[PDB]
Amino acid sequence: TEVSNHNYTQAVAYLNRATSSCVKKCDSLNNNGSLSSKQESCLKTCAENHAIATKIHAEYIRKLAESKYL
Amino acid sequence: DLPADYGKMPAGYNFLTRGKDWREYDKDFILRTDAVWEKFQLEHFFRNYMKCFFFDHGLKKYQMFEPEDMYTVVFEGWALDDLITFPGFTPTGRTNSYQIGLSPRQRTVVPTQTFYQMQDYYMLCGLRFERWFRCDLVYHDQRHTKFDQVKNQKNYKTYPCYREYYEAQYACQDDMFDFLMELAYARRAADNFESDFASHELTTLPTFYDTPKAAERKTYTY
Amino acid sequence: NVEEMDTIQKMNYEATVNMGRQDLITREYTFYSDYEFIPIQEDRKQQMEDALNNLHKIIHPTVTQLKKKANVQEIQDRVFRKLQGWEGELNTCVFSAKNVRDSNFCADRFTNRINTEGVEFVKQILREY
Amino acid sequence: PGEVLPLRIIKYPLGLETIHNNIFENTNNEGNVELFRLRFNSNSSKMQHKLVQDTIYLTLKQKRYNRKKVVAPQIKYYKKTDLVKYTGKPYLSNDKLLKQSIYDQTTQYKLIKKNKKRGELIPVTLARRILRTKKTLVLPAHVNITLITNSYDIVHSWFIPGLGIKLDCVPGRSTHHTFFIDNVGFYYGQCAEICGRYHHHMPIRVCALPFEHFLLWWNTFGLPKMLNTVSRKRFETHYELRKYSW
Amino acid sequence: MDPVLGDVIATRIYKACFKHVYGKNMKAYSEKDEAKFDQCLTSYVESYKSVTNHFITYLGQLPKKGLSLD
Amino acid sequence: GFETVVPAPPTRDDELRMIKATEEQFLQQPRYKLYMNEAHRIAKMNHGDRHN
Amino acid sequence: MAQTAHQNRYQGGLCYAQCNELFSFWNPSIQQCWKGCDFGVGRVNDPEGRIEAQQMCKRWAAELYWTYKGELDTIKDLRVHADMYPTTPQNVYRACLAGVRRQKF
Ligand SMILES: [Cu+2]
Ligand SMILES: [Cu+2]
């Protein structure tokens, strides 16, 4: 299988947005360079939530486009 | 008999029979006058009947092939096919000479006596398939979540339609089973329960088995 | 895990995973002509399951104490007829539902009906049987 | 057709299982006897996966024996490492010993086909011309074997003359017929119904042996087949010999 | 992708570090501020790595085809 | 459907009493009323009397 | 009656006739009760004989259909219905017990 650079850019943008959201939520910046145990747990949870959210939002956009076409 | 522990197994009984005097048991056995000829004939018969393997020399081992017609073995011995290694009667080397009988028959849910008068099990196969399809449609969705199709192998519970499926397969044939399976696939796609279309119960003659207080119908006595 | 299993055990694990993941493959093909219906919410499913669990817990004493399969089937059939009428009303409301608000309202109505009147019906049936 | 109703109520079957006299089959995590269950439909547009064909029937394809072209030497490969681990052309000696053939087996077969002497009372067991077959139905003796006779295309008839049996496998009719062979032996037969082009050559070979011999045949060729595992003998065959004992 | 994506990510990280350092404390710049920015950058890199790992795993964990495993 | 307490398995005395009662009932059947000896014989005889 | 001990049901005896009274005319429970009564020959009159007859009936029922250990002991209703067909080992045990109980002298 092969993937496109546009897809890579979209994935990178989604990852950047998810990382920004996770940092803002879990307050990852308030650390001395190492995330606490709670910080890492919150980071993992927020990353899973953001990945699910990205999948859901992409599916919603695709479904809206399909319903427009279909 | 005199000891109070007569018959109790001695502690740490090795059960080995090394250095056992065979004379003490001589009176316990009576041997026929033809015992020698009997031993010779028994050895010959055991060699001739049990040894269904051929000593292949190329691999220097026992070998076996599928049973072939006498001529196929006699006049066509130059073209043996599908030769494998004779694995032996038992993995542990035990004998296999024992008279066989009929196993305890499996439980019955759709009795064969319902249409046992007929020689071909057409109506029996139909009824068994209907019952199995009803049970499956009842418990189709939870097979992977609560039945033997689960991931936790220690939590595998026998499917509720196990005996029904086995009986239906026993009653029906291969082609009929396939056709009924296609029909049942169409029915499952429809998700049409037999109770969702049944109106034939109205146009049947009343029977003593159809009384209102069905529980009172049975008269149980010990 | 899979790497900790032999060939047979790995094949069995793959068999279980594939047999459990059939619906995902079935998620691919869809028929356009079907009238699409908004699925019932997971919260609504959980509430209905809780109501059914309460009904089963109520039935548990009489069901366990009864020694007649006929009596058990009769009680089950009466409860099934009542709950089937209620569920038919709920499903009729659900099929024609046009919004998640309507779905939630129908689910709440069905749960309340199971909670309020079905309890009285089951109590009367148990007092009889 | 139509669609799946959003919610359905199903009463689990009662009295189906009598293993431990527990008529209550379904019990929720709360432990209460689950008499009613709610089945909800998730995806309106999704189709349904077809039911899995759970039936796995060990298939033995009995066909007419064919003429051999050339006598190949028994070549066993290493380990799938096609290098010939073992090579040879055996021959069953008069002592029933698979010794090394010293003559040209191809020449022997060709000469036998070219010219074979005949006798006025040559045994049929020693003269098979339209009765040789590839596989023989291996069964035990002095036991009840049910045979479900059925036809695929037209009504055929399997007539074992030695067993004096004649089962008419007809389409649709799953004729369940009993068979009890009160003796161990090998029998040959042909189609008792005119099956068409091959109404002459549809040979059937039936070998009933001691129960030990039948079990050995099953364990060496039947148990190995229909295993649905890795085809390695040490992975299935020995495993079967380590999983099943009578 | 292209280095411009890295530049955009760097700009976002710089804005985040400024918020973490001077979002509520608008004071003069110093080596203390530089060290705080360096710590924030290290924390942001760690958070991005954790988010990428968790998101790729959750997206890799979601089934998409029958397990073949050869 | 109200259930009743299941009676315990009978003793030999109860078995003998039941045997005696069954023997009396079997002897009570007139020779003219040809009814096969089945579990439904009593109900069939009652229905036959009602029909007569 | 292939498993019975008499040439004909008429030679079975009154208990066998009692067996014919127990169940409906369309159940193998008649043969099962005949076998149970045959197990009761010279056993009903003695208490040890009756206990051994019950054990023998359990043994025959187990030899009839594949049954797990203890299931025949977990039977709640020893009472039988005239519509009880011999479909389960529990039914076989109940029929054999009834046949033993119906044997006199
Ligand atoms: Cu033919
Ligand atoms: Cu033919």
Outline the structure in words.
This is part of a larger assembly, with 7 protein chains of 7 kinds. Chain B is mostly helical and 222 residues long. Helices cover 33% and strands 4% of the residues of chain B. In chain B, strands 1-2-3 form a 3-stranded antiparallel beta sheet, with no helix packed on it. In chain B, α3 runs antiparallel to α5 and α3 packs parallel to α6. In chain E, 20% of the residues are buried. Chain F has 2 helices and no strands. The termini of chain F are far apart. Chain G is mainly α. Chains D and G meet through loops of D and loops of G. Chain F: This is Transmembrane protein, putative. Chain D: It comes from Tetrahymena thermophila. Chain D: It is found in: Membrane.
Write a concise keyword list for the protein shown above.
part of a larger assembly, 7 chains, D: 246 residues, alpha+beta, 5-stranded mixed sheet, 3 helices, 13 strands, 13% helix, 26% strand, elongated, E: 70 residues, 2 helices, 0% strand, binds copper (II) ion, nucleotide-binding (chain G), ATP-binding (chain G), Tim10-like_dom_sf (chain A)
Topology:
The structure is cut from a larger assembly and holds seven protein chains of seven kinds.
Chain A: H1 5-26, H2 37-69
Helix pairs in contact in A: 1-2
Chain C: H1 7-20, H2 22-26, H3 42-65, H4 69-95, H5 100-128
Helix pairs in contact in C: 3-5, 4-5
Chain G: H1 14-22, H2 29-39, H3 47-64, H4 89-101
Bound molecules: copper (II) ion (2 copies).
One copper (II) ion (CU) is lined by residues 156, 191, 193, 195, 202 of chain D.
Amino-to-carboxy terminus distance of chain B: 46 Å
Radius of gyration of chain F, CA atoms, in whole angstroms = 15 Å
Question: Approximately how much beta-strand content do the residues of chain F carry?
Answer: under 5%
Give the helices and strands of chain B as they follow along the chain.
HEEHEHHHHH
Provide the structure class of chain F: mainly alpha
Instruction: Record the strand order, biggest sheet of chain B.
Output: 1-2-3
Binned strand content of chain B: under 5%
End-to-end C-alpha gap of chain F: 35 Å
Overall 3D form of chain F: flat
PDB class: electron transport
Keywords: Electron transport chain, supercomplex, Tetrahymena thermophila
Entry title: Cryo-EM structure of Tetrahymena thermophila respiratory Megacomplex MC (IV2+I+III2+II)2
Chain A: Tim10/DDP family zinc finger protein
